[PDB]
Amino acid sequence: TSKQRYATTEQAQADQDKLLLFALHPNFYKRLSYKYYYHYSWEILDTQNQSIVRSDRFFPSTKERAAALEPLLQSLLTQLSQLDDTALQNLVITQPTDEDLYSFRLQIPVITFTGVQRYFSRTEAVDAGVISLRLIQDVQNYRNITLGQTTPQKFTYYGYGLVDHQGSLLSEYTHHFPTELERELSLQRWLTHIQANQLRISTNSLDSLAYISQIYNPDNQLILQGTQRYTSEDIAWEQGNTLMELAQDEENFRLIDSDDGVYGWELTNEGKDEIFAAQYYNSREERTAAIAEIQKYSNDEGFHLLEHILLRPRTKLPDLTAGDGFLPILVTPEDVNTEPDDPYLLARTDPYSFWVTIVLPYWPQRFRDIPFRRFVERTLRLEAPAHIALKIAWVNVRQMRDFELAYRHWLEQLALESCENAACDLTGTLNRLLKILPQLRNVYPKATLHDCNNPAILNQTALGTAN
Amino acid sequence: SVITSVSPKTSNQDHMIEEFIEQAIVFNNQKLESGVLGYESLNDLELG
Amino acid sequence: TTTITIPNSYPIFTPNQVLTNKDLNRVVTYLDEQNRLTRVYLIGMGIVAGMEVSSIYQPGDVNIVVAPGCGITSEGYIISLAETKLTHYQSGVSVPSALFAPSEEQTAASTDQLVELFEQEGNNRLALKNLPDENAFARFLADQTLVVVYELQDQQRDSCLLDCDDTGKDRNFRLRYFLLPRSVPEKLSAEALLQQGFSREPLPQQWRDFSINDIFQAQSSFFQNFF
Amino acid sequence: TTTITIPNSYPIFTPNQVLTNKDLNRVVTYLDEQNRLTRVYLIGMGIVAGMEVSSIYQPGDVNIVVAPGCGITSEGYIISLAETKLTHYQSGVSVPSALFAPSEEQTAASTDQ
């Protein structure tokens, strides 16, 4: 595969010669080693709610594990059934152990199970074998587990790929092997088949629309490009609040090694099932520096301070096309019969006096802790002047950028009028800011009921939707 | 708000203090298990 | 529309479930409706204790008085009054017609022009003491009835006063007093309310030529005739 | 079994608490049981308005008619009927007797025809 995307077929046809040239030279093929993966399997329980047998078939991801059950059950349903106990006992293997206990293993002409417990005699092992052979046909007894657990065991995979001169990675093999031997065998087979020249060059097309997440430096430099193609701008934005959290931990960076000149990384979940981005470098030092830089900008802490009396309307002749807007006031008709000096009413109708707004990002890992979040609010209120009230909001990635762009442009236009009457579109820049302030909201995690992995806690959880 | 005490001449309430008597004690503490090994004296195992 | 039915469905909760706002709205509506149905089907409807109406015109006190009591509306709401004294008025008030319709009716409707009575002085509320004379007051109270309306309002709670969290509405109830003409051919009147309320389903063929107050009065005037 | 007693336990919520479905179930059961106990102990039990049953047979019209009305069960549920016309039937239906036992009953039961 080309490891490249083209906009027009002319660019695709232009680059075929390079791929065909380098493909034919075995000295441009490199071996790669993807260090860490997980394994998943099932456990079979009995009536007394204990585990007897565990399946040997294992998967590198949960999605495949989930998919495989129905064919497996069907295979064991019709075939492994309708057999007299006399024939079932020929499928049970019993072996003595060091403690002078017996371990029972199960094999079916192949589907195998290892057996979890230990027995005092061969008869106990064989009856447990028969009982397990009967239980293994009911899906109600299957429980999903991760092998090698007190963290799960980490496994290594191998692969190979094709590079050009000067270290760029032209292509990668799409499958991974549990051992070097299968990798070497597949590489030899591919090399012989390509040298035989007994080619077929294709150009394939993707989806029409695709949105991509991106991370930038303070100096407008691009890092962490991303690999998943989203179907809508809204989905790409909602997924950005999870990428920004995974990037903060170096445990989530899978490492791609090789013998010479090729180094890279991949960013995955906590469970190593899905990939969000990947990138390749020419040395260990560039890869090490790049990982540390990404972790830095995913934990940028600070706030912005906005003073409401400067949002005051200023236009004195609103007879033209446009004028200054107003803030919301939150009053009802029943207030017409009370005094305008009421401290409760006056606070609602006058949003321009001694009011201050503070906006903070929520995703940094110290700001996701609610007990820490509340202590920070208390400190701000102690330091502020006695007669001033504060509004404090903890926002996500979509609203933080919407605020910062409108906020920056208004500050620049405000300065120009004071610094020699040189502003353009001052009122329009203001009106585009008064529409974002009412929309800021605090972010809380979603509620899940607790009974006897993230329990809902009252006063700090949000509700979901019907569908 | 400021916290102060209760007095029988500013309100009609006082602090209520009574004497503790040993022989009239009742315990509120239920055994987690009973009649099984590990939870009873040797004199109380009935060999069911 | 239809008569209120007995609610047969109300969600049950399970562990490790995401909850929705409709999942709670459904149970609150269920319990409210069952209490209302008890009150309306197993006891009855209407004024329980007296609420006799009087009108006083003294050189120093001009008002309308309604005596204490309690009652049930047709929909299980309890209305409880105590010594209500009305002294100010405001004419030409626009009131929605959906205010008198069943709750199950979802249609919007135009507004009518009623007169309101108030106990306290207001911005646009003329006192009864400023009437020219007793004859003007008497012409004010001619061929008219009172009605006490129990209005429901869904008010949205404030969002950012100290903290910008999301909030939801509340449901409040209000009492209003409207002075209504007895019979006006093209405007809202007591007889029109009776017609809309009772003439919902066809009556026997022998009653077809009566108005609702006529069909009521024919039974009390039974014994003066037909003896 | 025995008569229905008066509810004794219903949780109270305090700040920063973990929500369990058992508490919501407990509050809804409490409120429903209070409504039913009111209806049963302070008013009465049985058929309120008449529900006389009639059988009509004509060469082209075979029916059983139940007149409209309302009624209260012994547990406090309201049954309300309106002009019920029964004209089809299914014989030999197996129905569990657990339908006729009180709600406090726990035993499993066979079915009748």
Place this chain on the structure above:
Amino acid sequence: TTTITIPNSYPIFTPNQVLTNKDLNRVVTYLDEQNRLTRVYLIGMGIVAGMEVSSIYQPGDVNIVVAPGCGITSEGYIISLAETKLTHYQSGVSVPSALFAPSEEQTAASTDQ
């Protein structure tokens, strides 16, 4: 201070909210007030079925017997008794004053003997 007032407010829920104590406590209190208001304002207050008290003295038996029945408290709580036979006693017990006071009663009162 005053008679119980009919409730006039209870939370309404909308999607995407942060839930707190009051949004549950107010609905529970609202529904309970509705039930007890029904019982006291439309039926009445007091002892429904008789609870006669008797005092029996024998050489072996000294007791005070109360016969079964039901009754409604002036705030809508239902009391139901069945054949209570009192045989033991304890004198000089201190009882809070708020045990006989209205639920809204805020004041200061000593215990009694």
